Design a protein around this nucleic acid. Structure first.
Ligand SMILES: [Mg+2]
Ligand SMILES: [Mg+2]
Ligand SMILES: [Mg+2]
Ligand SMILES: [Mg+2]
Ligand SMILES: [Mg+2]
Ligand SMILES: [Mg+2]
Ligand SMILES: [Mg+2]
Ligand SMILES: [Mg+2]
Ligand SMILES: [Mg+2]
Ligand SMILES: [Mg+2]
Ligand SMILES: [Mg+2]
Ligand SMILES: [Mg+2]
Length: 48
RNA sequence: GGUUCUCCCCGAAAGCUAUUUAGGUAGCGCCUCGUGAAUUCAUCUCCGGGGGUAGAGCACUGUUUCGGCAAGGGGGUCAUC
């Protein structure tokens, strides 16, 4: 127990998705939106 | 139109329905991750079923040719009260 030996529970912290950061990321160009509809646009999508 | 580091595992759709809808979107179908559960599911063999397609046929609804039977047509001639 020193200020540089404390570590979080396992599974307690998970990295966020980061869209549009290359091929390898698995989340490049389109960023998980597919091609070219209303739902791909910034602000795009239909009301409830 | 563009969307910037890496590796591992799985892996579609371009259909149906609706839409001032048709290059948009929503539910379902197909993809993924998780949880739960029945020999649940597949192929083969044997058993039980309904069919009206392929082929065929011409009783029926239609169509078609030839021959006998000819109803009855129509043509001559006299009649034509
Ligand atoms: Mg990822
Ligand atoms: Mg990908
Ligand atoms: Mg694009
Ligand atoms: Mg399109
Ligand atoms: Mg789309
Ligand atoms: Mg805008
Ligand atoms: Mg694969
Ligand atoms: Mg179909
Ligand atoms: Mg209808
Ligand atoms: Mg039968
Ligand atoms: Mg038939
Ligand atoms: Mg036939």
């Amino acid at each position: 127990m020193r200020l540089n030996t404390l570590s979080p529970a396992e599974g307690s912290k998970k990295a966020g998705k980061r869209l549009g950061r290359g091929i390898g990321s698995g989340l490049g160009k389109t960023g998980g939106r597919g091609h070219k509809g209303q739902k791909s646009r910034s602000g795009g999508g239909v009301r409830r």
